[PDB]
Every structure is written in C-alpha cells, then in structure tokens.
C-alpha cells in the first residue's frame, strides 16, 4: 500500500502509451507538412483532438496521488511533471468561451489588414506587400502611412477579446492556487533540492534586472553611433540626440537592425567579406555543404549521423505538381528517428542555417537516451544556445580559411574582421532589450499592475524609458500595438531569448578558453580539439533528469548566469568606439514629429 509503487506502475504504463501515441501523431504531422491536402488537414484535426482529450483524461487520472510523502527525487519529479495540468479546472461554459475567444484572436489577427486610402485599387496582402514596402521603402510619408495604417487596423479589433481573455486567464490562475498567470509563467524556472540548490521565483527577475543594469551602457554607445550613421543616411530629418523612429528600423516592429548594415560600412572601398562568389564558382550543392558540415561536426569529437537521415530527408525540390514548404525546420520525431526539411541556397546565410539546424538535431540525439517523460532539454533556450555557440565558432575568418575556400595570398584584414564583428554586434545587442521590455510589459499586464485604461500609456512610457525609441503620432487606448507580433497574438512566451544569449556567451567562452587559444576570445576555432567535445558531451547528454542549475555548473564552473563573456567579446568594439569622440552621453527624449 505505497503510493510510490502505485505511481511507479502508473508511469510504467504511461511511458509506453504516450510514446506510441506521440510517434503516431508526429508521423501524421510530418506527412501533412511535406504535402498539403484537405485530407491531411483532416488528419491533423482529428489527431489533435484525440490527443487533447487523451492527455486531459490521463492527467485527470494521474491527479489522484499525493506529493508530500514521496521520497525519491526522480519519482517525485515525474509525479510533478504529470500532475502539472491546465484547461481542466474550468467549467464547460468558461472553457468554451475561452476557446472561442482564442480562436477569434487566431482568425482576426491574420484576417485584418489595411490598404492605401489614396489609391483604393492598389493594395495586396500583408505577407508580400507590406513586407516588401518595409524592406524597400525610403520615404518618410510612405513608411509612416504603412505603420499607422497597420497599427490602426489591428488593435481596434484585437482589443476587446484580448481584455476578456486576460481577465478569464487571471481568474483561472487565481483559482488554480497560483498567484496569477504571470506567476504561473514565471514558475517554469524553479527547482527544488537540498545542499543550497533551492531556486525561488524572484531569482529570475532579480538576475535579469542585475544583468540589464550593467549591460545598458554598451547599447547606449552603439545607439549613438547608429544614430549618427542614420543621420548620414537621411538628411535634415531626425533629432541629433533623439530617438530612432519606429518606421525607420527596417521592419514594422524593429525586432532586428539587420537592414541598416549597408548604411554603416566605414570603408566602401573595402566591403565586407563575400565568399559567396567563390562558393558559386566552386559549384557545390546541398549534399556537399551538408557533408562539409558533418565533417566539421565530427572533427570536434561528436559521433556520425544516421543512415535514415540521408535516406529520407528531402533537400532538393522535385519540381513536380505537388507543392511543399521551403522553410527549414528542425524535426525530432523520436524513436531514434531524426529528419530535416529545407530548400538550400549557396550563401553564407544558408551555411549558417544548415549548421544551426545540424546543431539542433545533434542536441536532439544527445538527450534522446532518457525515458519519454525525460526526452527534453533542461530549459527552453538550451537548444538555440547550443546552436548559436557553434554558429559563432564556425562564423570566423580563420575557419573559413582553414577549410580552404580562401586564397593563400590573402592577408588577415583587421578592417574586414571589424566589419563582420560590427554586423554581428549590431544584430545581437539590438535584439535583446526589446524582448526584455515586452516580457516585462506582458508579465505586469498578466499579474494586474497595469489597469485597463493604462495599457498603451504604460507601454509607451516603458518603451521610451528603456529603449529610447519615440513614436511619430499620438494614439489612444483603442489600439493594441504590443499584440501586433505573432508571438503576442498567439500566446507565446518571449522570455526564452533574454537567457539564451547569456548561455551562448558563457558556453562560447568556456569552450574556447580550454582549446589553448592564443589571441582574444573571439575567432576561436574548436576544430581538432577533442577535450572540448568530451567536456560538452555530458552537457549534451545529461537531459532533464538533473536540475538545470546542477547541470550547467559541470561545464561553466558556476551554477548562475553571468554576462562577463559578452563584455569580453565586445571589448574590441568598445576600444574602437576614438571614432565617436564628439558623442554626447545621455538623452532627454522630448523631440517627436508631433510638434
């Protein structure tokens, strides 16, 4: 009469049951994704409904065991994972209302769009049209028109259902013994153990704030330089010590600053490195680039790929009548089966995407030895961090030289190296503060610190005070700008990135300090270095059995996040930035196109 043994046999049956059902569902999903049909979407719908009902029933059945009298770490963790349940406490009426509200979001967000009032006839869908306008537009009035039109067409329809959804979710979260929905979302990091391994909920926000406070000045400096370069790009148009307008960031929301690269090259005579010419000249293909990537992966000390990978993965378009989707993605079906689906071009960008996907799949086989409930990463950002560390490792001039795609007579151009580092820095350091801003706003809204009539006011105030980006026109509370992004519209957490960069820099520094590198941390190549791979193998194969704080230590040397590798990597750019000696520090953010 031991609940330990009862839960043990429960999990023993649930393992095989869930494994078989999951493999069948994943196979159906892949078959749908390769070729699209009405029959395929019918299979998708029926399988999804069957899994929803089946998992709900299994969780309800498993909810009949206690948690205060379980001793074994692993059994306790499995019981917690199975007991954590949702969408079951609510009654039928409230559940149906919530489902209808979410479906209304998912429909009207994609359905709503704006067009030109000047020319009613000429306007296309959001996907090709507005994206092309934003990526190839250089007119103040045109960009302002597109931005204002979209932001006035989406929010006025997304506001009410979103408010009702947030109220209902807050009520449910309070009913489910959590503090609120924000508390539930924050509760994805806590770990319970002894010997000083406790992890509460406030630690995450504490460390995030501590990191941002000491990381902001580099963003200030790069913002000053980018503002000066943008002034060079466009004349007599923006305040000299003000902000960057939201419509001049290359895209609607300004998630990335990748489009500003041609407007900030210090030396036109010496452009950035472009080995794409030699890539096309050598006349290789997807098979060849993937063989080179596999060779690079093997050279570190990681094992070979599976035969079924090459046997079944599709890389070159057949060109027949049936259509497919050409968006590379990482597939992990389970049952020792791994597949990829991508359409390949010969550029550095596709080189990097192929390498990143290969790293993702490598992690996937790395933690695939655990039981079904443990076939998962330590946290959300581990996969992308593991991909990006080796992406940065393989994105260096010494590597692209030592694979012999560069002429022997070429000398190491520090200017080209600085160009590449400037590009990568302008992307990375500009990516994260917006993510931290939006996640803080979402958490505050969910927990309820922001009342109804203060949504947009608080959003804009936080935007200005954190990032330093101004708006060109006034707006009222009816608009719902922060939900314009797909992740916010479709209820996806945005904290998995800012975390991911910190882990990326920490792992890069730890892995490159051991390969007996002579120069600075950057440019380090881990090729022909067995000990780094041996150290990283336990990190890759640990899985989720151990807590992530315990796991990360075995490689890093510490069990808490730190941002020292970021600064030590970006120090050369800081030393370079003598160029901007006429740059003033600080801003007021009081000049806008309203006046």
């Amino acid at each position: 009469s031991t609940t330990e043994d009862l839960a043990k046999t429960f999990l023993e049956k649930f393992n095989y049951e869930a494994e078989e059902l999951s493999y069948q569902n994943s196979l159906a999903s892949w078959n749908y994704n390769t070729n699209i049909t009405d029959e395929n979407i019918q299979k998708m719908n029926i399988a999804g409904a069957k899994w929803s009902a089946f998992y709900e029933e299994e969780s309800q059945h498993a909810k009949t065991y206690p948690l205060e009298e379980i001793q074994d770490p692993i059994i306790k963790r499995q019981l917690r994972a199975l007991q954590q349940s949702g969408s079951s406490v609510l009654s039928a009426d409230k559940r149906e209302r919530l489902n209808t509200i979410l479906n209304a979001m998912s429909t009207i967000y994609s359905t709503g769009k704006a067009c030109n009032p000047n020319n009613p006839q000429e306007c296309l869908l959001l996907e090709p049209g507005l994206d092309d306008i934003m990526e190839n537009s250089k007119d103040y009035n045109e960009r302002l028109w597109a931005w204002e039109g979209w932001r006035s067409e989406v929010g006025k329809q997304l506001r009410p259902l979103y408010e009702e959804y947030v109220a209902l979710k807050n009520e449910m979260a309070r009913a489910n013994n959590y503090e609120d929905y924000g508390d539930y979302w924050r509760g994805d990091y806590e770990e319970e153990w002894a010997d000083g391994y406790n992890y509460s909920r406030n630690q995450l926000i504490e460390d995030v704030e501590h990191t941002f406070t000491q990381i902001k000045p580099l963003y200030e400096h790069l913002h000053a330089y980018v503002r000066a370069k943008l002034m060079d790009a466009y004349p007599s148009r923006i305040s000299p010590t003000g902000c960057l307008p939201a419509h001049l960031l290359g895209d609607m929301w300004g998630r990335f600053w990748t489009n500003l690269y041609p407007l900030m090259v210090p030396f036109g005579q010496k452009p950035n490195i472009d080995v794409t010419d030699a890539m096309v000249n050598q006349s290789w293909d997807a098979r060849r680039i993937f063989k080179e990537a596999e060779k690079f992966f093997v050279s570190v000390g990681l094992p070979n790929m599976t035969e079924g990978f090459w046997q079944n993965s599709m890389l070159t378009e057949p060109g027949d009548n049936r259509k497919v989707v050409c968006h590379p993605t990482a597939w992990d079906l389970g049952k020792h089966d791994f597949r990829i689906k991508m359409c390949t071009k010969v550029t550095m960008d596709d080189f990097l995407t192929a390498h990143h996907e290969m790293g993702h799949i490598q992690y996937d086989m790395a933690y695939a030895a655990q039981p079904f409930l443990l076939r998962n990463g330590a946290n959300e950002g581990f996969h992308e961090a593991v991909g990006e560390i080796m992406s940065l490792s393989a994105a260096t001039p010494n590597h692209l030289k030592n694979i012999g795609l560069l002429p022997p007579d070429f000398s190491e151009d520090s200017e080209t190296d600085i160009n590449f580092l400037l590009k990568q820095a302008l992307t990375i350091v500009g990516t994260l503060p917006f993510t931290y801003m939006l996640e803080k706003w979402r958490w505050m809204v969910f927990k309820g610190e922001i009342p109804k009539e203060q949504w947009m006011q608080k959003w804009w105030e936080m935007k200005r005070d954190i990032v330093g980006v101004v708006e060109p026109l006034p707006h009222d509370e009816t608009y719902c700008d922060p939900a314009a992004l797909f992740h916010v519209a479709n209820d996806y957490s945005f904290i998995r990135y800012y975390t991911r960069t910190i882990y990326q820099f920490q792992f890069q520094e730890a892995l490159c300090q051991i390969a007996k590198h002579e120069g600075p941390l950057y440019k380090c190549d881990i090729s022909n270095s067995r000990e780094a791979g041996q150290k990283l193998h336990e990190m890759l194969s640990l899985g989720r059995s151990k807590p992530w704080t315990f796991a990360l230590e075995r490689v890093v040397g510490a069990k808490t996040m730190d941002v020292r590798p970021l600064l030590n990597y970006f120090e050369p750019l800081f030393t370079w930035l003598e160029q901007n000696r006429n740059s003033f520090v600080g801003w007021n953010t009081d000049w806008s196109p309203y006046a």
Binding site: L27, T306, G308
Partner: protein, 192 residues
C-alpha cells in the same frame, strides 16, 4: 538435414511470453558467416569452431522477437522487465544465441501491433517457465469487480513496430540454441 530452412525462414514468430520450442536431431549445424547480423555469439561451454567436435542429447531451439534496447538482456544474471517476467536462464546456461535484423520483412507502414509481451507478474519467473494464462493482475487492497483501472491493470502490452524508426527500435528475430550432454543416446550428429 535438419529443418534449419524452417527454423531460420519461419514466416511468423510467436510473442515473447508465448515463445515456441522445438526438438531437432540427426543432423548438424554448418553456419558459414554473418548470418547473425546483430555477429552476435555468446556461448561459453563450447567454442564456435569446436562445436563441431561435440554431440548433444536435448535441444530447446526457441524463437521470438524483441525490440532493439532489450537484446542486451539475453544473458545470464541480467535484470529488466523481459528478464524477470518473460524469459530467465540459470547461471550455467550453455547455448549460442543468434540474432539478426528483419525490418524489411516484419514491418508495415500502417503499424504492427500483433506482438505482445507480459509486463506485470506477482513473482520472479522460474527458468524455462511459460505463463500463458491471461488472469488479471491486482495491485491494491480493495477488490476490483471486473472493471479495469484504479489499481488493477491488464498485464499484456503491445510492441508497435514501424518501418521508419531507428535501429534502437528495429525488430530482431532471436534464436537460442540450447544443448546439453547426458547419459541419453546421441541425437545430433556432426560433420563426420
């Protein structure tokens, strides 16, 4: 002169708990090479080349199928669900185990669930014992009244073989060549 053709080219294989057993005599095994795709040969009292210098009285040539991970468990003094509840051998086992992959012949696209193996048993199984009875297994104090679930589970469980899964889940047929030497007259000959 044996039905090695029949024992090696059997169209269907029984379940693990319902494993089959046969008796052979008056002939000799002459395996050349590589027929055990998974070069698996773990037998102790004899040698792979010296086996032709011996004769045997009793033979228990079993045949069944197992998934990829559990092929390691076919060894004396081994633990795991298969070992404790389905098939056990004593510490003095004398027989050479043959195993090979037959994914091209024993897998279908629609999914195969015709193979079963017992998962629950009250006590550790005795060597060379088969429990084909489908009696219900109980786990609690209060008695179930013919309705399953709630601390009374059905023992058996399916395999679920597919053609696209990896090697670690690919089905292999397994043959155990039991032999023993006693006062009984010689029944199996050699390459005389």
């Amino acid at each position: 002169l044996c039905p090695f053709g029949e024992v090696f080219n059997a169209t269907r294989f029984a379940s693990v708990y319902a494993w089959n057993r046969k008796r052979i005599s008056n002939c000799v095994a002459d395996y050349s090479v590589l027929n055990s795709a998974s070069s698996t040969f773990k037998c102790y009292g004899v040698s792979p080349t010296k086996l032709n210098d011996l004769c045997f009285t009793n033979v228990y040539a079993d045949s069944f199928v197992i998934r990829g991970d559990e092929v390691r468990q076919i060894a004396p003094g081994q633990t795991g669900k298969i070992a404790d509840y389905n098939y056990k051998l004593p510490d003095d086992f004398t027989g050479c185990v043959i195993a090979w992959n037959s994914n091209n012949l024993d897998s279908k696209v629609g999914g195969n669930y015709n193979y079963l193996f017992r998962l629950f048993r009250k006590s550790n199984l005795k060597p060379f014992e088969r429990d084909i009875s489908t009696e219900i297994y109980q786990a609690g104090s209060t008695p179930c009244n013919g309705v399953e679930g709630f601390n009374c589970y059905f023992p058996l469980q399916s395999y679920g073989f597919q053609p696209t899964n990896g090697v670690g889940y690919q089905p292999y047929r397994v043959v155990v060549l039991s032999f023993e030497l006693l006062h009984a007259p010689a029944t199996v000959c050699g390459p005389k």
